[PDB]
Amino acid sequence: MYVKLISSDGHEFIVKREHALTSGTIKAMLSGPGQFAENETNEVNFREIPSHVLSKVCMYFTYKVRYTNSSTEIPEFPIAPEIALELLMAANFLDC
Amino acid sequence: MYVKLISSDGHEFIVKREHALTSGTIKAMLSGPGQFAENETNEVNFREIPSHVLSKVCMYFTYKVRYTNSSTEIPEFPIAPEIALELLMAANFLDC
Amino acid sequence: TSLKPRVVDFDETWNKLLTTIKAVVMLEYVERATWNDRFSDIYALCVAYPEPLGERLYTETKIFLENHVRHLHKRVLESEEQVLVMYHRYWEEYSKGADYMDCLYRY
Amino acid sequence: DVFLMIRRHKTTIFTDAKESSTVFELKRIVEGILKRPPDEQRLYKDDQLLDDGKTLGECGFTSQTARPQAPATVGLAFRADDTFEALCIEPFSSPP
Amino acid sequence: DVFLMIRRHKTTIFTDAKESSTVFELKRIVEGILKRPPDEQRLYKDDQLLDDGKTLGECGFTSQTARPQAPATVGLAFRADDTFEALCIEPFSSPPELPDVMKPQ
Amino acid sequence: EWIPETLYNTAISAVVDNYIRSRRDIRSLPENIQFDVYYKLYQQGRLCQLGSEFCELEVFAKVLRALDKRHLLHHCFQALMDHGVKVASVLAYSFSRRCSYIAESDAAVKEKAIQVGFVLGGFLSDAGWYSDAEKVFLSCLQLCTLHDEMLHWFRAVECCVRLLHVRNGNCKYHLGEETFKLAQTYMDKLSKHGQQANKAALYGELCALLFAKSHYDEAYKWCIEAMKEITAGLPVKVVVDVLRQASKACVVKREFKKAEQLIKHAVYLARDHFGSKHPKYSDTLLDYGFYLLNVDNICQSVAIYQAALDIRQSVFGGKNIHVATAHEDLAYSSYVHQYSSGKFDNALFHAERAIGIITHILPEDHLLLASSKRVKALILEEIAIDCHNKETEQRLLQEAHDLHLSSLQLAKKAFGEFNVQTAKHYGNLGRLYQSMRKFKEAEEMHIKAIQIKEQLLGQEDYEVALSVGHLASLYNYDMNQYENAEKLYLRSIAIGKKLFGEGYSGLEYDYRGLIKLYNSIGNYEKVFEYHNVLSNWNRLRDRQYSVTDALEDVSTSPQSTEEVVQSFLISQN
Amino acid sequence: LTRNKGP
Ligand SMILES: [Zn+2]
């Protein structure tokens, strides 16, 4: 059931489907003919998102799905200074 | 009546002497041992000033001499951004 | 590569997009990797240096959709006495293709 | 809750489990995704051999060092031709 | 008035001329500077010979494209008694490559 | 709720906090991302890091390309101008200097520069920096009138319809006529080559020029022409411009029935396409408040002007000429509304803040002071005569004298001697000298205003009725010349009753003056009958006071374009 | 009050 995020350099980033559906872009790429070829996992490919930032994207997916509408005070996402801008380019493209 | 503003590259810029005395430094370089050149036009070596910027210096000479005490509105000197820094140090050294 | 603005040529990327966009509509099969890479092509056209090609992409997508609907119209109208069933099949194909297209052109 | 980044070579599967949960059900999670028997693989918790039993609470990590925004990585490896391959978890990428 | 840069190989005459003046006066200026006969001087306006009969205004030089700020170049060649010579205007130099700051890198 | 922050919005915070090390790489971002980093720098108070990037033409050009977030851009740009950095003039100088270097380049670079100049000059015109938008549009016009090609006349006249706009707002009316002539010259060259361009925008801006110059007789003809040149394919902004300016030109020529149609259609179109929080919708609200002010519907004009100001304080910030115009318009409207109540606290607050902005962003000799000062010098009058003190009254009248004298000097410098604005300043000075107990100068200024308003505007107009009201209030209540005061009251009541029906506000001032006039000489039958007329006036006013708010009075889609225009044009005969 | 408003 978990989707299959693939980075630019071939790293596999299996994350829960409900976690990846928090981003509208993956919501689009999984739909359409992306849902025509289905196996035990849903494969989505990012040819220009490096692994060091797609890992943080998946971390944000987990962080966002766990802290959705929770009364506990939410700490900020710890974005490293070296990977900020790239993640900012990964956040717009993924609409997350 | 003409001087030969030789640049560092080797491009001689034969400009009028009245144009050359717009700059105080060229006037100084044409005074003393610099005026002893008997071969008509005086050669003013500029081994620190490249040719592409000394050409703009000579254009400024012919611009200021022709546009001095002008009754009409005067246009600004067209100076490229990629040559502006080199022509700034050329304007200080020539005091024009 | 990277998710940065690039100097991209609109013609080649648009042709790669066209080969897939003509198959997204009318329920033709495309490769899942190809469908995923077309999203990167859409993004690259929308962030291209020195001017975004989103205006050109929008104009060419509208032109392609208009041309496809006109071709489909000349395919359905010339066959009378069955325009209802042919229209139904065409509308089913175009509706699913248009939903998948809005998924593709989401950026 | 405790969040994990079970990683083997390129695969970087993201999992979650309770603090009171044990180590064994992690392989149960892996069965429904990687299609592998549970005894076929173990976990390299900080490149060190981990027992099949025990529990995640005293395993060396808790809810404070395994936040969803920065989950703790866990190694994993398979058995290939009657021998077990050593872990080769590569770093994701070098940030620029 | 028209402003020119009479360039031959590396020399660059920053002279001026009237728009109604002819090529003969310009060649006489080059007489007054490089002490060469006008019969040994073929002037090129971007690979185009200027006949001695016509004026500077007719051949293309005007007071708008040859301002004192940016005078318009004109070629020069010398005969040396052997079928003249081709135009060999040497470009000045390359200013340092100052890249566009907003270019993605 | 406690929603987690978006990874886009969280990475903006991380990138901004690492802004210094990544200054060069933020320029290498998509246009939507690059705005959000700069808007976060504005939101974080780092205006000097923001201002070091907005001073540049080409960084600001990509920021300008985010059309949806133009209100945020206007807010942060006004914050930079209030910060101290002169980004409006820096960008104009940078555009002109970088744009004069490509006069001999190919057509592609030239048209790219013209497009960038249109975007930047339109921004500076919407932001209110008309002096810094004229240079941009002048450079654009310079590059359009270089090559003898077909599309260059279109771009040149599109430059000139915006030079005339940024010169009316800059009160440079003497360049406006020559800009119109030059635009008409390029329209002639377009018409000779078989390409007719739309003349609605230029004729509208000329109408605004002539209305500002108090040439309402010719401005009405030019707005007729502009409304004739409205087609269906016009941009909505141009149609709204023509409608609001034609409505202002109709309400000043006593065409109240036409003016309400034009201005309500303009308000509906502005609220439809743009929205309820757009600067152009605020412009339409200002002109609709001008209408409501000029048709005695003062109470709705106050709420309409406050709606215009609240939008202009939202999109823009502090020291802006658009907020200043909204203030000087609301201050006068509140002055009119609370003229009888005497509570000039909000009116003085808006008048003082209007001058506090124009004196900060405009030179001391600009004409835009002459309006605002006038408004303050009205309000400061009424507070002074309401205050029982003599020292405060004398000081406030001296201050109002200074403001009226400066406004009149500006009117002399720009408009001349025989202008309607000069006549307004003369009427205000006559009112002041009536309050200053300088009776001879009061009647001299009032009669000079009468002469100027009668020979230029005409005998049957609102302004001359108000001025004869002032003159005969001086004669009756103060100067004790009871003979001609009767004639001037009869003239004033006749014009007011014929122009605004029986519910004109100045009718009660005229009636009280006439009752005092008679009671000082007897003839108690006149006093009784005119007391009855005044009682009828009070009975009519409170009946018509209960009218719904003017924001929803225009409703949602009551009519349509080319129906308002046709209804305005077919009845011109 | 004796006069009307100001123009
Ligand atoms: Zn600052």
Side-chain angles (χ1 to χ4, degrees), chain F residues 74-88:
Chain F
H74 272 113
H75 209 159
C76 67
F77 194 84
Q78 190 54 58
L80 300 177
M81 299 287 298
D82 297 8
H83 187 42
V85 62
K86 293 182 183 292
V87 294

Side-chain angles (χ1 to χ4, degrees), chain F residues 423-442:
Chain F
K424 292 181 183 292
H425 300 166
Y426 282 162
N428 284 30
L429 263 188
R431 287 167 96 262
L432 198 41
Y433 291 150
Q434 186 189 326
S435 294
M436 289 265 268
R437 300 318 185 122
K438 317 169 70 148
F439 278 38
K440 168 55 193 62
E441 301 95 313

Side-chain angles (χ1 to χ4, degrees), chain B residues 2 9-16 19 40 51-52 55 58-59 62-63 66-67 75-78 81-82 86, chain E residues 1 3 5 7 9-16 29 33 35 68-71 90-96 98:
Chain B
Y2 279 80
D9 292 331
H11 291 87
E12 326 187 320
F13 295 101
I14 296 91
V15 68
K16 290 175 70 175
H19 300 341
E40 300 183 351
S51 65
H52 67 272
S55 166
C58 296
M59 292 179 209
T62 62
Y63 154 74
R66 189 264 183 274
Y67 282 72
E76 200 78 351
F77 193 65
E82 68 273 15
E86 281 202 326
Chain E
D1 55 354
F3 290 76
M5 320 189 300
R7 296 178 66 189
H9 281 70
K10 294 196 145 161
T11 62
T12 307
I13 308 183
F14 279 91
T15 189
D16 74 336
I29 295 169
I33 298 168
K35 58 171 145 62
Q69 295 84 17
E90 177 40 67
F92 300 128
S93 277
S94 179
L98 214 52

